[PDB]
Amino acid sequence: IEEQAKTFLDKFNHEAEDLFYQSSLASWNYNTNITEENVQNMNNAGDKWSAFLKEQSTLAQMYPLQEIQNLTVKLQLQALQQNGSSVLSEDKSKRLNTILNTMSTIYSTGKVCNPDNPQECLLLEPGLNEIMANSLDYNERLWAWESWRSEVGKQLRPLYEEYVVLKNEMARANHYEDYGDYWRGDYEVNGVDGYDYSRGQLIEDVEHTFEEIKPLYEHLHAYVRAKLMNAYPSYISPIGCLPAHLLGDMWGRFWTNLYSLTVPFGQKPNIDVTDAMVDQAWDAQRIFKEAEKFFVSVGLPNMTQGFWENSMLTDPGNVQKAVCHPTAWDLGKGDFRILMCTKVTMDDFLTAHHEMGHIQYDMAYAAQPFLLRNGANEGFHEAVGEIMSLSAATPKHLKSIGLLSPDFQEDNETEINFLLKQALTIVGTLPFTYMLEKWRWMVFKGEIPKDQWMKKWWEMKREIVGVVEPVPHDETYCDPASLFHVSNDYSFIRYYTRTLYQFQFQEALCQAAKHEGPLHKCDISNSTEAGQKLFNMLRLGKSEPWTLALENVVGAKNMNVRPLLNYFEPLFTWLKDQNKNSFVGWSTDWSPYAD
Amino acid sequence: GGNYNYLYRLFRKSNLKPFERDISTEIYQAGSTPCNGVEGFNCYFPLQSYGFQPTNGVGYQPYRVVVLSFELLHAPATVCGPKKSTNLVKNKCVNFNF
Ligand SMILES: *[C@@H]1O[C@H](CO)[C@@H](O[C@@H]2O[C@H](CO)[C@@H](O)[C@H](O)[C@H]2NC(C)=O)[C@H](O)[C@H]1NC(C)=O
Ligand SMILES: *[C@@H]1O[C@H](CO)[C@@H](O[C@@H]2O[C@H](CO)[C@@H](O)[C@H](O)[C@H]2NC(C)=O)[C@H](O)[C@H]1NC(C)=O
Ligand SMILES: *[C@@H]1O[C@H](CO)[C@@H](O[C@@H]2O[C@H](CO)[C@@H](O)[C@H](O)[C@H]2NC(C)=O)[C@H](O)[C@H]1NC(C)=O
Ligand SMILES: *[C@@H]1O[C@H](CO)[C@@H](O[C@@H]2O[C@H](CO)[C@@H](O)[C@H](O)[C@H]2NC(C)=O)[C@H](O)[C@H]1NC(C)=O
Ligand SMILES: *[C@@H]1O[C@H](CO)[C@@H](O[C@@H]2O[C@H](CO)[C@@H](O)[C@H](O)[C@H]2NC(C)=O)[C@H](O)[C@H]1NC(C)=O
Ligand SMILES: *[C@@H]1O[C@H](CO)[C@@H](O)[C@H](O)[C@H]1NC(C)=O
């Protein structure tokens, strides 16, 4: 009966909040002060949380799921009843964890040695990522691109084939058709009177939104190709694809390292307020106190006053071994801490606004039950953090926060320099993200057999992304598995939808703050009505369907690409005038070796 | 490490009458199945403990409460405020209260 499930969850909601607390408090003491008497302090305290949750999970199947009427207590029950693994045979369950540990340690400890000196050998993160991000030598970028895929990616090919079979068995025992349908279960919504969403409906909404970005991406692809021919003459065709090893990093995920070759007006400095911070003696604490004044300006609460003692805003005065990585912690019981090692720079002035945005999202849904204290889907949590960073990087906000000469002149040449640096990171990553999840979805359902994995991968690079390989690759390579998110078992569609939600939030908040100009000049400071539009979504958590959360801000029930294109229309107008003598589009027949 | 000595009751058959008190420790029975003094599904111990810890956000830290309740049965009198004493004088026509 349904009233027994309510009494089940309230014993759960008070044993979990304490056991999650000290399992996360011990993870704080390891992260900010590393010993090994802290790693053993967090492994036993971490396993008491994991052993407790599988005990309550096997108690949750005593209650049926379709004999429930209240939507909230049904949502908590389905998130706890989830079997996930453990549906496999107990010798297949240990084979899967052996593969996931072997693929993870090949990626982090794989070395590449030089053919002129076999005694010097580079790892990926120090040394191989620096070549792909800084070099202008064609022959050295071609060496680092091919040798990472032929010496490390060939080890992951027999391991990734066994990984697909075991993950499809686990997904079909949980009544999905494949493992790709298991990943799309985040966006599913069942029976809330007009707000429903199918797991197959996500596939059409991604492909419908993508064919409206292809006019903008084609003009960006044509402008970068014309600028790369001056940097690498006799290597690039003026009507063809771009070679895969000249894109700024190892995989071509972000084009953000191509800015020094593709800058529109290099005689205008892109605005940088780092010298005005060290001329006014701003400490470590000023960067957060101006960040807290931004959020109280819009109508959001202060920091919790436990935030100021418990947090560790710099690396300590001790030479203290403590993972230095910006992050926002939500230990529980209303205890919010930020861990970062901040330097006096406009870079960490902006990520301070980003990391505080995770805190203000966390402080808002802290009145829901324990199992609904996440973002409404996997994409909302990063998207609310980046609309705080866009509004703080504007020169309108910088001159009113005291950091820009009240006699500063923004010209139309510097807005093109700023918008093109945004499009190399935002627009340049959208066909990469769409192509990769489309390839992984077709591998799991079996539309691509294993004798055509690397054949269909490079046909989709030339057609969707416009990127050609420099050396042909047969079915002994596995080039997707040489990325971190593929070999470490992570979903990748959250980076596509976060980019679309980010400009839907920003365009909906700037109509409430009564903006008049272009969308990229907007700032939501001093408003109250925009914050009330934002706070009505922030407090929902997972208690409502995410389509119901979007109408509280945007006014629509689906993700939309038209606010993303309105941000880049000053660039799209300027790009169509720079490509009057160029060719827009590419040919899938040209190759850098096929002459 | 958590002060686990401060408990509260989280299951009862029926809400309390005003100023009523209940220190029993019988195993609660949520479902219809009888409990027979042992724990299990739908048979819960009725007391939980605040695990208080010094690094808790406000609203999670312990507050001490005192409830004063003045009652007036039908006696002849009892405790009350304190009476003040105004300075004294004399030899002058005055308005007095003794
Ligand atoms: C890292 O934290 C641990 C524990 O928080 C520190 O180790 C001991 O902590 C106790 C407190 O319970 C002290 O009485 C001991 O003196 C600490 N050990 C030592 C060797 O000092 C540890 O000190 C912290 N790390 C550093 C570098 O201070
Ligand atoms: C079941 O649904 C009802 C409404 O559909 C929820 O009722 C609300 O409960 C809160 C506190 O529990 C009250 O403050 C509200 O006034 C109630 N609303 C109404 C309309 O009466 C109820 O909370 C849900 N059950 C659970 C366990 O959350
Ligand atoms: C979870 O996996 C189990 C198999 O281990 C599935 O079958 C359940 O088996 C248990 C006994 O171990 C029964 O109590 C359940 O009734 C069975 N399933 C149900 C509730 O029909 C079970 O179907 C899986 N649960 C999910 C999430 O589908
Ligand atoms: C920035 O604004 C100036 C001012 O309008 C633009 O200069 C004009 O450019 C057009 C097209 O080349 C000419 O027909 C006008 O005669 C120019 N104006 C003047 C006063 O000379 C300039 O092109 C703009 N730059 C960008 C990048 O948009
Ligand atoms: C936006 O908010 C800021 C912060 O309160 C306002 O800045 C104040 O501006 C006045 C006059 O411009 C100064 O006298 C104050 O010293 C400023 N306050 C601070 C804390 O620096 C700003 O005026 C607001 N914008 C509008 C349009 O009202
Ligand atoms: C936030 O804190 C400041 C001082 O730190 C205070 O003046 C302000 O009133 C606080 N905000 C609210 C809503 O009380």
PDB file of C-alpha atoms and ligand atoms in Angstrom, chain A residues 265 412-413 416 574, ligand 4:
ATOM      1  CA  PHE A 265      42.038  42.444 -35.782  1.00  0.00           C
ATOM      2  CA  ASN A 412      32.934  47.533 -33.111  1.00  0.00           C
ATOM      3  CA  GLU A 413      36.318  45.951 -33.937  1.00  0.00           C
ATOM      4  CA  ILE A 416      34.245  40.905 -33.317  1.00  0.00           C
ATOM      5  CA  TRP A 574      30.570  39.857 -40.497  1.00  0.00           C
TER       6      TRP A 574
HETATM    7  C1  LIG C   4      32.860  49.698 -37.541  1.00  0.00           C
HETATM    8  O1  LIG C   4      32.120  50.909 -37.791  1.00  0.00           O
HETATM    9  C2  LIG C   4      32.680  51.747 -38.814  1.00  0.00           C
HETATM   10  C3  LIG C   4      31.846  53.007 -38.851  1.00  0.00           C
HETATM   11  O2  LIG C   4      30.660  52.825 -39.614  1.00  0.00           O
HETATM   12  C4  LIG C   4      32.704  50.990 -40.140  1.00  0.00           C
HETATM   13  O3  LIG C   4      33.308  51.801 -41.141  1.00  0.00           O
HETATM   14  C5  LIG C   4      32.461  51.860 -42.314  1.00  0.00           C
HETATM   15  O4  LIG C   4      32.646  50.711 -43.171  1.00  0.00           O
HETATM   16  C6  LIG C   4      31.805  50.704 -44.336  1.00  0.00           C
HETATM   17  C7  LIG C   4      32.068  49.403 -45.056  1.00  0.00           C
HETATM   18  O5  LIG C   4      33.454  49.220 -45.313  1.00  0.00           O
HETATM   19  C8  LIG C   4      32.103  51.933 -45.191  1.00  0.00           C
HETATM   20  O6  LIG C   4      31.223  51.953 -46.310  1.00  0.00           O
HETATM   21  C9  LIG C   4      31.928  53.202 -44.366  1.00  0.00           C
HETATM   22  O7  LIG C   4      32.305  54.339 -45.132  1.00  0.00           O
HETATM   23  C10 LIG C   4      32.774  53.139 -43.096  1.00  0.00           C
HETATM   24  N1  LIG C   4      32.554  54.318 -42.276  1.00  0.00           N
HETATM   25  C11 LIG C   4      33.419  55.334 -42.212  1.00  0.00           C
HETATM   26  C12 LIG C   4      33.029  56.472 -41.318  1.00  0.00           C
HETATM   27  O8  LIG C   4      34.468  55.335 -42.847  1.00  0.00           O
HETATM   28  C13 LIG C   4      33.483  49.691 -39.976  1.00  0.00           C
HETATM   29  O9  LIG C   4      33.420  48.917 -41.167  1.00  0.00           O
HETATM   30  C14 LIG C   4      32.926  48.860 -38.819  1.00  0.00           C
HETATM   31  N2  LIG C   4      33.729  47.667 -38.617  1.00  0.00           N
HETATM   32  C15 LIG C   4      33.201  46.453 -38.438  1.00  0.00           C
HETATM   33  C16 LIG C   4      34.176  45.334 -38.243  1.00  0.00           C
HETATM   34  O10 LIG C   4      31.988  46.266 -38.434  1.00  0.00           O
END
